[PDB]
Amino acid sequence: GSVANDENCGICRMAFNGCCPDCKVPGDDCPLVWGQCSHCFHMHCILKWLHAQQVQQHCPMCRQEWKFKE
Template sequence: MGTRPLSDGIFFTCALPSYTMLKEDEIYRSMISWHAVASWTWDAQDETCGICRMAFDGCCPDCKLPGDDCPLIWGSCNHAFHLHCILKWVNSQTSQAHCPMCRREWQFKE
């Protein structure tokens, strides 16, 4: 494990991979250790917008209309978002828009 100072009192620690020579032209790498620093999961049945994280039955952060007055939009991947949230998301993408949840190419569900 390697440790090096980044600045006064702050150190960066990492586990370095080990290398084993198996053949003359092949090098295989094995991981010594791995430490997750964060974990994020999403319940597909959740009743909140995946972009603004507001409940669908609450107020949309853009139009301020209560639940049923702000339309929900589903993608072909079956993820649902507030209309205003997904339109902003799609328009902010520089290339082909992708679903913010599953990263599939975004298409509005017919």
Template sequence: MAFGILIVVGLKTTWRGYFILLFYFLVHCRWHAVSSWTWDAQDETCGICRMAFDGCCPDCKLPGDDCPLIWGACNHAFHLHCILKWVNSQSAQAHCPMCRREWQFKE
């Protein structure tokens, strides 16, 4: 089902004296989504080093070393060593590497 709205936006005269009606025709259509895309906040890899969270980051020697996960206020998770390097490498205010929001540690 669709319906339209005619909106007159102006009247213009050509060099021969003819009038031209300027208008827009807006069409409203009903839309039915077949599928949708959502961001998976429960990603299983670090967004900086791309290593799995159940493994270890490149700075750690062995899996199981003290490499905890750190969440930001934006709900993105990273290895502790990875996000600390990222924050320290930013010259100005640090931003989340995934969504570019201002980085703040989740409390």
């Protein structure tokens, strides 16, 4: 669990210090992407979330215009 840990994604609830679920990559070019806010999701993941669904663009969590923050 009931703890509030933001160290885990929301789409695949994985540790930012790990490799994507659908990606068996060792750890070379598979980092993560952050948003306007603490929001931190895996590039490929999030990217696909918005790159697959054009209907809604608003962040998958906040109602703010999804921003590909650095």
